[PDB]
UniProtKB/Swiss-Prot annotation:
The chain holds residues 147 to 332 of 348 of the full protein. This is Tripartite motif-containing protein 16-like protein. It is found in: Cytoplasm. It comes from the Eukaryota. Keywords: Cytoplasm. Belongs to the TRIM/RBCC family. The gene is TRIM16L.
Length: 187
């Protein structure tokens, strides 16, 4: 085990769920790439699962009771990556239905020069500097959600959340601004 190999022991497949994606989000690369293409909508069927107002998408996969790791690359100020539960309101207009505004979701925002940790309408600006690639580590029984900046020969802890998990969690993504994009790495 290299340093990164400690986390790769727990690698988990994550792909975007097309049935959740807001109509301004385009999915590519077998549901491993998402891009905000506002004001150009895409003709997705109307489904109760689909986010209506917040420009969000969930993973198809849920995680429950073990340790998990995956990597993403983020592009653009306004991107959030984190976790939520199935019961997040898909049709809501208010902050309780975005991934920075409730007590069952946790997320990390990139604003163009710093990351910010979000939980339940509370924000903590960080000074970690930029990282294109983030490693997302979930220790469900341990109540840990950690974000690492990942470079060739390095991992750097950006933020560790202490989380009171209950339901299975889904990877959750919020692409708040035009041209925001997130990709899930191979692993």
């Amino acid at each position: 085990m290299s340093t990164r190999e400690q986390f790769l022991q727990y690698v988990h497949d994550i792909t975007f769920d097309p049935d959740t994606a807001h109509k301004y989000l385009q999915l590519q690369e077998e549901n491993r790439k998402v891009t905000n293409t506002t004001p150009w909508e895409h003709p997705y069927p109307d489904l109760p699962s689909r986010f209506l107002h917040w420009r969000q998408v969930l993973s198809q996969q849920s995680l429950y009771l073990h340790r998990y790791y995956f990597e993403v690359e983020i592009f653009g100020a306004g991107t959030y990556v984190g976790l939520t539960c199935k019961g997040i309101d898909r049709k809501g207009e208010e902050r309780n239905s975005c991934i920075s505004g409730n007590n069952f979701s946790w997320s990390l925002q990139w604003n163009g020069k710093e990351f910010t940790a979000w939980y339940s309408d509370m924000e903590t600006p960080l000074k970690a500097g930029p990282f294109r690639r983030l490693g997302v580590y979930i220790d469900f029984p341990g109540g840990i959600l950690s974000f690492y900046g990942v470079e060739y020969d390095t991992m750097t802890l950006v933020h560790k959340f202490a989380c009171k998990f209950s339901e299975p969690v889904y990877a959750a993504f919020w692409l708040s601004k035009k041209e925001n994009a997130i990709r899930i790495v191979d692993l």
